[PDB]
Design a protein around this ligand. Structure first.
Ligand SMILES: [Mg+2]
Ligand SMILES: [Zn+2]
Ligand SMILES: [Zn+2]
Ligand SMILES: [Zn+2]
Ligand SMILES: [Zn+2]
Lengths: 463, 100, 193, 567, 58, 115, 105, 73, 46
């Protein structure tokens, strides 16, 4: 035992030199037993086995010792040993996977697959990865496949999803070179649970499945981006990979509202972010190369964001609304001769959706528009009356419910007259993917619970 | 490596020998109906797998009706290689064939 | 009569001067028959790098023999053999059944290739009782095992101590014994004796 | 087939050849020895005809590559043979070169310059030069005379070859045309008739004996004549410097001939220039081993609810049992001493092996063919072999390779309809539900593929499958409306990868009023009876509806005629 | 794993390789990472650690 | 159009074996919408409306301990007109090994019906 | 479409040296990297390779019997019907091979 | 109406791999098994094989061993 | 008769060149008559 069992494995290693290897094969069957089984090798017997191997790894680099290594690395619940055998099992892996650097790809399949446990049980998993992903630097590549291979399913347990999400956000914390693929993993997967929920507006499972995952991203990212990480760190990097995945993933998908709320959370950390998040929503709502369905869908992201963003000033908000009113004024210069032409009203559906943003901003920020002097912004009387007397007629072809609320707060201030043309509507008496598109506001009140509690920092109500 | 380079000098010299130059193309100046069907076949297979389209769609949704339209303005960027039974060929572009 | 000796590393690696070490970085010009997607029909140079040359950066590929660093000078061979080199509209053969274009290429790959018998000098990042862990050029992993350590060298708690009684650290010169390339990671088996 | 996975390699030419004995023993996995096929448990024997190195079987894994029965390609094994055997297809070309060899001179019984003439005609006819092969008769003027005739003939062949390569008249890989292919069939028909019309050996004067055959590859060597031994013994000074004959001695003379007859038999078995210089060997007529097919091409034949043995397993069984009667009787004469054996005991073993050396050969002849084996069990409609599945009207080439069966096709009764166009067809709503078409997702059809996924598999216009960016199908059959709308909003969402960053999702939409079908009516006489119509999907019926203007082309009469329809 | 959308079907070495000295390696390594600035990032990160090593900065 | 199928389990029995499977319901779990179409001896109710997927008999095995099922195979929706309990002409063997079901199929004059 | 795409259409694999579709198999892996496709006919036994310079590491593979091999790694994939693969089986019983030429070389 | 089997060859399930969506097998949540097709033979020495599942062949008529002999006594 | 044309072709080592429309159905290429009588190349800029 104290001297015989050390000579027993030494007489097992001696038979390795003579190509026999059966007492290795029996003792390999001894190691790889379950931890819950009392037939296993105990703790003080594991101490004898590991220092005789860590003394000389340079004998078992053979084709007949590959079950001996495989029995060691598949130690079921290896991290739950006592910390005097744990510190030698850990020290064995830091010698095996550096002396023989072909064995790292097998244990890294285990250290990533066992991240379905909570963070307080895999504290020694994350210490080893930050060691080897700087010391085997070429292993930075293929572990990206290992991250995405073992991600649990959207109809798997609530246990496995939140323990796997939180363990990955630990791996985000120190490997800044990976960066993109972790945020590309979750935002591709949280969107796969979100499009179920908007149709519910298996509810009780799928609702409580995502809000735990969607909180654990938002509480993590409000810690990751900070005022001392913009001017001095890489919080400009956390913003850009969050705003380039909003453009590529959340724009082209349809009929979703729980995921753009993470950009209702990161953007409110500072003021230059909300300028840059605004200039993100500007140059995609007006670039001429895209199809209209991206310039229509992003204009609904313009109207329902500025109406609900808590931190704003006329030095941004009116100054884009001055140019928006010039963008409408330059739209009524060229194409008000193209309203009697041979053609339909569909040519200005970009305009009515542009005008829709103004009757949504007016319903939520009208008390902001009053200056000190008592005059409106940018000749509202020369604007709100002028656009409706044209042949464009933006009351008929725009929304029915969110613009009728504007015509009550229009004639609470009498800034324009539009009810006689409503009396003209009932006097005078391809599109279905657009007709059900302007009835879609992104930042409407959330149906979840916990993320609404996190949103009393900067989300406003209808009141 | 040199036995590949010595191999490659044969394959390029043969294809230069087989190719009939542009001034001596003695085949027909028309688009035979087996050539028109494959041009609208391949161009509709590229529009379907996200190629850049050179026209304005006017609400078409079928990728055959787009490539039929794009031949009507001679915008199709393909090149027909009309084989002769010795091995030779004559690169006729689509823009220089009289479609009927 | 019959030879399978065409896996021989035809270019031996020199020893750098003035130094004691080698040079193992070469430039080999390859040709390769690639595919091309129907979305890169307006940027075919950009589309070949984004699809076939970027997955070869900093990995192993046995046809060039070592580790590919990077590339320079991608020229798509033209399918019209009467044009010149100065043309800017090249032709690419489209498959019959599928719309995927297939083509040839010419490109220069800068390879770092070590061989058996060369001298390499690299850093030490772990000293154990059975090996010395080594990085070469801060990218590639190496090891000098116990049986290749000379018998007049000692260990202490730790770090290895040489014949005269000093610790060894950092740039430890050695010669190559084997290059293991089985898994997804290169492995240089070194030897000090 | 899928248009997102392209192939890059193309097959251009299929050279032929003969599988050799050193070739099969390399590529094979597990030599089949045991004559049985299963043990008592219901499991395959490690060394039998269902071995788990020849293909994954019931639930196991194939021991060579380690994949399931739905991923294993299969592998082929081999049976050993102690006797070589007669190949029952390469028999008559062995039978001809048997009856033309000289058993004493080790050459052919023809001349030495007549054979060299037919070689130099056949070499020029490889390169297509039909003229210079015919001008070789124009070269004619003892000991050094025949080495001057052979010298200028080989110079004239070499002069004509290098002259015909200076221009593009021929190339080194050799031309071959149906006119050049004609003259080769006239020389070889003449070179084989001239070899079978010999008496005395015209090289060294001896007299070779006779051979005579049976259909079961039984050949009997006839002994000589008194007049011909009289010529043999008196010509025993110049050359001074009906028993059933078995297989191995016939092998031993033919390697001796084919080593000496290279420069003429090089060109008999080569219609093209030999660029590999693979020398002809006489082993190419004898089946030393036997390649059994993989287990997946030898599955048992279910009939109703019972399971019978595979019919090719029976013909491979009887080879393996009879190879154990000989392999015991091979070691029987060797373990027993060769001085203890009498003149009777050597003659009673040699009346047991000579009965079993026949029945090993009359089973290779039964495994390959059924006509060229014995008449067994009074007719019985016997067990078909390998050649019998590669044959006439119901064979392999005329039932499974020239005319196949198709996916995405329907057939029903036709009925008249004047209210559609002449170029249309009325698809009823029972075909407009099962027939699909992979229509990929781009920006112009995403308005319509969302509406076609939400509609589900049982509402026209609808769809019945999705397909992700990595080939992974997702059906829509059991899904409810909130799960189909969960997938309909996710068609254009990019799935992040580096391999499939180009491809996109194909939706298996239903058939529409836009598509085109390909009607057909058997019997199809002329090419205008397989036309192509545009679909018009009608409600409330079960028959295909056709206009009367197309009943001139299909010769259709509307009383029970049925027409196919492809897609 | 690897279809023919991310794999060449052949790669053939045309010439014999030429041993390049370090001063032109540093010129190539400089001019390569400038032009390469999505999955290229984790390869060119490791390349940035190589070019610092050749000039010599631990 | 009438049509008769003979539900049988006296086959594959190897000439001397015990009655391996029996008709009738078992005692473990079985999905209980089998009771909507089968009576309590493993025979269908006379006059029911069968489709492709409905059961026609529920034989409880013994060597697999499970309440098995047998299903209607043709895709045409048929009724059930008569069920006969055929007994053995030889000695006892008396666990009802041969049953004969007759399905009645409606045929209304459609489009494509010859006259 | 009616005779290749919509009946069988198996993308098989060929060797680019011996030119056969039936003697290719997936090598079982070593230590546990990715698996690769290898050919039996072009390959040698590994101990025979040590009898005739050091053998490269990346050109060794093993079947599911543990036996090592060298070579047989030059292979690509082509698109054939399946009845060709049945025919190449049936012709090899009669002793006939069908060597293919697969371009590009 | 289902049939138990593996989980799935992807991480995107657990399921009991239900029966045949016509031609191939399917999991509960949609994913068609990639890839195997149902075989059939449409047209001596009788063997002990009981092919039932999807046209593939199964084993002989010995069950789990002692239960047929413990319950018989 | 399939065996007869087979045994002549193996004894000659005849390379089939895949030109008939019955040979290209066996191997599985595209036919030569009709629309399979030319090649379609693409014209990419730069
Ligand atoms: Mg009729
Ligand atoms: Zn296998
Ligand atoms: Zn002689
Ligand atoms: Zn091969
Ligand atoms: Zn599944």
């Amino acid at each position: 035992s104290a001297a015989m069992y050390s000579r027993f494995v030494k007489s097992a290693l001696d038979d390795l030199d003579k190509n026999d290897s059966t007492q290795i094969g029996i003792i390999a069957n001894q190691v790889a037993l379950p931890s819950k089984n009392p037939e296993r090798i105990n703790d003080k017997n594991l101490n004898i086995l590991l220092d005789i191997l860590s003394s000389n790894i340079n004998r078992i680099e053979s084709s007949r010792g590959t079950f001996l290594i495989q029995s060691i690395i598949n130690f079921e619940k290896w991290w739950e040993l006592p910390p005097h055998t744990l510190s030698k099992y850990i020290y064995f892996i830091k010698i095996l996977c550096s002396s023989i650097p072909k064995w790292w790809q097998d244990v890294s399949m285990i250290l990533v697959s066992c991240f379905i446990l909570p963070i307080k049980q895999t504290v020694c998993h994350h210490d080893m990865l930050k060691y080897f992903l700087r010391m085997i630097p070429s292993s930075m590549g293929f572990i990206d496949t290992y991250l995405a291979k073992f991600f649990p399913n959207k109809n798997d347990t609530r246990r496995k999803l939140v323990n796997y999400t939180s363990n990955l956000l630990k791996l985000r914390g120190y490997c800044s070179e990976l960066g993109f693929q972790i945020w590309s993993l979750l935002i591709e997967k949280i969107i796969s649970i979100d499009v179920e929920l908007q149709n519910e507006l298996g509810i009780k499972e799928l609702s409580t499945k995502l809000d735990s995952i969607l909180t654990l991203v938002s509480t993590h990212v409000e810690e990751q981006v900070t005022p001392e990480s913009l001017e001095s760190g890489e919080g400009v990097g956390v913003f850009n990979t969050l705003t380039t995945l909003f453009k590529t993933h959340v724009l082209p998908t349809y009929y979703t509202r729980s995921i753009q709320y993470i950009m209702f959370h990161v953007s409110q950390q500072q003021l230059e972010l909300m300028d840059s998040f605004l200039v993100t929503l500007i140059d995609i709502s007006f670039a001429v190369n895209e199809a209209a369905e991206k310039k229509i869908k992003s204009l609904q992201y313009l109207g329902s964001y500025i109406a609900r963003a808590k931190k704003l000033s006329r030095t941004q908000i009116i100054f884009v609304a001055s140019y928006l009113t010039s963008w409408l004024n330059r739209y009524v210069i060229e194409r008000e001769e193209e309203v009697d032409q041979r053609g339909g009203m569909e040519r200005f559906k970009h305009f009515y959706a542009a005008f829709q943003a103004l009757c949504y901003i007016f319903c939520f920020r009208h008390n902001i528009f009053r200056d000190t002097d008592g005059n409106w912004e940018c000749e509202l009387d020369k604007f709100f009356q002028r656009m409706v007397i044209s042949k464009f007629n933006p009351l008929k072809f725009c929304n029915e419910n969110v613009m009728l609320m504007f015509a009550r707060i229009a004639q609470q201030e009498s800034v324009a007259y539009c009810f006689s043309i409503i009396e003209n509507n009932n006097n005078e008496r391809t599109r279905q993917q657009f007709i059900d598109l302007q009835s879609y506001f992104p930042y409407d009140p959330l149906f979840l619970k916990n993320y609404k509690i996190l949103m009393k920092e900067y989300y406003i109500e209808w009141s | 490596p040199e036995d590949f380079q010595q191999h490659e000098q044969i394959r390029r010299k043969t294809l230069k020998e087989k190719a009939i130059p542009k001034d001596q193309r003695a085949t027909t100046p028309y688009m035979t109906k087996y050539e028109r069907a494959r041009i609208l076949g391949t161009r509709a297979l590229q529009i379907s797998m996200n190629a850049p389209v050179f026209v304005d769609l006017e609400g078409e949704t079928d990728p055959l009706r787009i490539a039929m339209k794009e031949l009507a303005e001679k915008k199709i960027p393909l090149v027909i290689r009309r084989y002769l039974p010795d091995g030779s060929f004559e690169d006729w572009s689509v823009e220089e064939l009289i479609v009927d | 009569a019959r030879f399978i000796k065409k896996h021989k590393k035809q270019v031996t690696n020199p020893i750098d001067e003035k130094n004691g070490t080698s040079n193992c970085i070469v430039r080999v010009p390859i040709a390769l028959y690639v595919s091309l997607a129907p979305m890169y029909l307006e940027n075919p140079l950009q589309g070949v790098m984004k699809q076939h040359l970027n997955p070869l950066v900093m990995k192993y590929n046995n046809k060039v023999g070592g580790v590919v660093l990077g590339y320079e000078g991608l020229k798509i061979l033209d399918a019209d053999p009467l044009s010149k080199e100065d043309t800017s509209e090249k032709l690419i053969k489209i498959t019959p059944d599928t719309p995927f274009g297939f083509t040839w290429c010419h490109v220069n790959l800068y390879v770092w290739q070590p061989q058996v018998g060369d001298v390499l000098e690299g850093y030490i990042f772990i000293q154990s009782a059975s090996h010395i862990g080594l990085l070469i050029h801060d990218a590639f992993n190496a090891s000098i095992k116990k049986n290749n350590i000379p018998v007049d060298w000692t260990f202490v708690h730790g770090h290895w101590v040489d014949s005269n009684g000093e610790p060894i650290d950092g740039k430890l010169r050695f010669t190559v014994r084997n290059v293991h390339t089985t898994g997804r990671v290169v492995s240089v088996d070194g030897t000090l004796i | 087939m899928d248009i997102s996975k392209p192939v890059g390699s193309e097959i251009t030419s299929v050279d032929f050849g003969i599988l050799t004995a050193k070739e099969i023993r390399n590529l094979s996995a597990k030599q089949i020895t045991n004559p049985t096929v299963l043990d008592n448990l219901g499991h395959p024997v490690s060394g039998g005809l269902y071995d788990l190195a020849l293909g994954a079987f019931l639930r196991n894994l194939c021991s060579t590559c380690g994949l399931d029965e739905k991923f294993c390609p299969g592998h082929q094994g081999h049976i050993e043979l102690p006797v070589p055997c007669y190949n029952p297809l390469f028999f008559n070309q062995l039978y001809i070169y048997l009856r033309a060899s000289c058993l004493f001179c080790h050459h052919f019984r023809l001349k030495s310059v007549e054979v060299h003439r037919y070689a130099c005609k056949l070499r020029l006819l490889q390169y297509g030069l039909i003229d210079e092969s015919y001008k070789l008769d124009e070269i004619t003027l003892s000991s050094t005379l025949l080495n001057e005739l052979k010298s200028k003939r080989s110079e004239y062949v070499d002069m004509a070859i290098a002259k015909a390569l200076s221009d593009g008249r021929t190339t080194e890989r050799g031309s071959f045309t149906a006119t050049v292919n004609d003259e080769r069939k006239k020389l070889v028909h003449e070179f084989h008739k001239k070899l079978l019309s010999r008496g005395k050996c015209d090289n060294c004067g001896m007299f070779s004996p006779k051979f005579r055959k049976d259909g079961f590859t039984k050949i009997f060597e006839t002994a000589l004549n008194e007049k011909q031994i009289t010529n043999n013994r008196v010509k025993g000074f110049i050359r001074q410097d009906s028993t059933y004959i078995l297989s191995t001695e016939v092998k031993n003379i033919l390697d001796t001939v084919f080593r000496k007859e290279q420069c003429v038999l090089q060109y008999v078995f080569h219609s093209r220039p030999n660029l590999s210089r693979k020398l002809v060997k006489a082993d190419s007529f004898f089946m030393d081993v036997l390649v059994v097919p993989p287990t997946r091409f030898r599955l048992p034949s279910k009939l109703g609810e019972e399971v019978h043995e595979n019919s090719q397993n029976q013909l491979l069984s009887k080879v393996l049992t009879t190879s154990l009667l000989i392999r015991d009787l091979n070691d029987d004469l060797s373990k027993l001493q060769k001085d203890k054996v009498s003149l009777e005991d050597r003659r009673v073993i040699f009346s047991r092996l000579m009965n079993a050396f026949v029945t090993i050969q009359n089973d290779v002849n039964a495994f390959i063919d059924s006509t060229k084996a014995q008449g067994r069990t009074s007719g019985k409609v016997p067990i078909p072999g390998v050649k019998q599945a590669l044959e006439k009207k119901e064979g392999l080439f005329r039932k499974h390779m020239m005319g196949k069966r198709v996916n995405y096709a329907a057939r029903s009764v036709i009925s008249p309809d004047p209210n559609i166009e002449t170029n249309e067809i009325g698809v009823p709503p029972v075909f407009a539900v099962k027939l699909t078409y992979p229509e990929p997702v781009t920006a112009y059809n995403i308005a319509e593929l969302r509406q076609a996924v939400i509609n589900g598999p049982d509402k026209w216009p609808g769809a019945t499958q999705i397909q992700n960016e990595d080939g992974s199908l997702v059906s829509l059959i059991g899904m409810s409306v909130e799960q189909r709308k969960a997938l309909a909003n996710q068609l254009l969402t990019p799935s992040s990868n580096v391999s499939t960053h180009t491809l996109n999702k194909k939706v298996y939409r239903h058939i529409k009023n836009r598509d085109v079908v390909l009607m057909n009516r058997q019997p199809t006489l002329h090419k205008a009876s397989m036309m192509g119509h545009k679909v018009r999907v009608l409600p409330n019926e079960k028959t295909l509806r056709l206009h009367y203007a197309n009943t001139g082309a299909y010769n259709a009469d509307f009383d029970g005629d049925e027409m196919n329809m492809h897609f | 794993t690897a279809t023919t959308l991310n794999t060449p079907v052949v790669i053939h070495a045309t010439q014999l390789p030429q041993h390049v000295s370090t001063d032109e390696v540093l010129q190539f390594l400089e001019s390569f990472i400038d032009e390469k600035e999505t999955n290229l990032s984790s390869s060119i990160s490791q390349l940035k650690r190589i070019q610092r090593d050749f000039k010599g900065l631990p | 159009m009438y049509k008769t199928e003979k539900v049988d389990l006296a086959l594959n029995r190897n000439r001397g074996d015990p009655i391996t499977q029996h008709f009738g319901f078992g005692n473990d779990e079985w999905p209980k919408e089998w009771l909507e179409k089968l009576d309590e001896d493993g025979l269908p109710y006379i006059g029911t409306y069968v489709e492709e997927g409905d059961p026609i008999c529920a034989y409880f095995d013994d060597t697999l301990n499970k309440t098995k099922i047998k299903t209607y195979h043709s895709s045409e929706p048929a009724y059930i007109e008569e069920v006969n309990l055929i007994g053995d002409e030889s000695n006892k063997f008396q666990e009802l090994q041969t049953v004969s079901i007759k399905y009645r199929i409606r045929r209304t004059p459609q489009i494509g019906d010859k006259f | 479409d009616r005779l290749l795409n919509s009946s069988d259409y198996t993308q098989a694999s060929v060797c680019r040296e011996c030119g056969s579709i039936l003697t290719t198999q997936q090598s079982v892996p070593r230590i546990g990297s990715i698996s690769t496709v290898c050919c039996r006919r072009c390959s040698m036994r590994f101990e025979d390779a040590k009898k005739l310079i050091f053998i490269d590491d990346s050109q060794i593979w093993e079947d599911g019997q543990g036996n090592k091999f060298v070579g047989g790694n030059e292979t690509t994939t082509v698109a054939i019907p399946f009845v060709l693969k049945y025919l190449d089986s049936e012709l090899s019983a009669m002793g006939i091979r069908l060597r293919y030429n697969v371009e590009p070389k | 109406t289902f049939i138990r089997g593996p989980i799935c060859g992807t991480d995107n399930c657990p399921s009991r791999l239900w029966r045949i969506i016509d031609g191939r097998r399917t999991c509960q949540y949609g994913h068609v098994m990639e890839g195997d097709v149902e075989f059939n033979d449409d047209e001596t020495r009788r063997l002990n094989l009981t092919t039932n599942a999807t046209g593939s062949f199964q084993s002989s008529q010995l069950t789990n061993s002692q239960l047929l002999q413990q319950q018989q006594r | 008769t399939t065996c007869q044309f087979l045994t002549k072709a193996v004894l000659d080592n005849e390379r089939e060149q895949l030109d008939s429309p019955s040979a290209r159905i066996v191997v599985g290429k595209l036919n030569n008559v009709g629309t399979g009588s030319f090649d379609v190349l693409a014209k990419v800029p730069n």
